[PDB]
Amino acid sequence: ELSEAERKAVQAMWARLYANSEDVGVAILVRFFVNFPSAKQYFSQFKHMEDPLEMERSPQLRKHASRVMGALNTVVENLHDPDKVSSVLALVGKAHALKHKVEPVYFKILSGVILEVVAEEFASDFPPETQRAWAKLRGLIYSHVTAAYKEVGW
Numbered sequence: 102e103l104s105e106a107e108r109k110a111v112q113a114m115w116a117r118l119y120a121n122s123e124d125v126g127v128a129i130l131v132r133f134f135v136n137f138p139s140a141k142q143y144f145s146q147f148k149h150m151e152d153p154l155e156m157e158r159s160p161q162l163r164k165h166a167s168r169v170m171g172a173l174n175t176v177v178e179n180l181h182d183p184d185k186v187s188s189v190l191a192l193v194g195k196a197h198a199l200k201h202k203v204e205p206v207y208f209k210i211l212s213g214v215i216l217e218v219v220a221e222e223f224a225s226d227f228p229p230e231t232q233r234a235w236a237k238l239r240g241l242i243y244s245h246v247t248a249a250y251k252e253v254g255w
């Protein structure tokens with residue numbers, strides 16, 4: 102789990118992100134789909150879309166952006182309550198394993214894009230203590246999502 106200082110570091114960072122949650126979520130996903138075109142295969146309204154301006158304006162992209170940011174928000178705000186973070190990430194993990202059939206490695210890829218976007222957009226607020234805290238959060242997400250895939254015999 103995150104230590105108290107790490108949790109505080111992650112929540113303070115996340116608050117800055119979430120002040121324009123909508124735009125940050127979308128910028129993250131556009132970068133994800135441009136840089137990893139294979140990930141678009143799970144999205145019916147944009148699986149063959151290439152123009153990043155259209156991706157930015159895509160209703161189904163912006164919707165998934167809103168749901169990624171909201172589920173992340175739930176995890177970050179409730180990091181002091183580890184049963185809640187377990188709860189949320191299971192539900193996500195399973196859902197993506199079973200309904201959406203997404204290869205679990207795409208979570209690792211998306212997290213790397215999330216890191217790249219955070220490092221760019223909020224660099225002057227991203228000291229090493231915070232970078233390390235954020236990296237623990239990423240590990241936490243990937244291990245919990247990865248355990249949920251194993252749980253239903255992926």
Ligand code: HEM
Nearest residue numbers: 140143144161165168169172173193196201203207208211
């Ligand atoms: C931090 C990681 C992610 C979070 C928190 C997240 C969150 C969500 C949530 C809350 C939903 C709506 C409920 C549901 O139908 O499951 C959703 C839908 C979906 N997600 Fe994710 N997601 C993540 C990563 C991914 C990745 C990497 C992919 C595939 C590359 C993906 C593919 C989908 C698809 C195909 C849907 C259905 C969208 C639709 O109904 O049009 N997600 N996501």
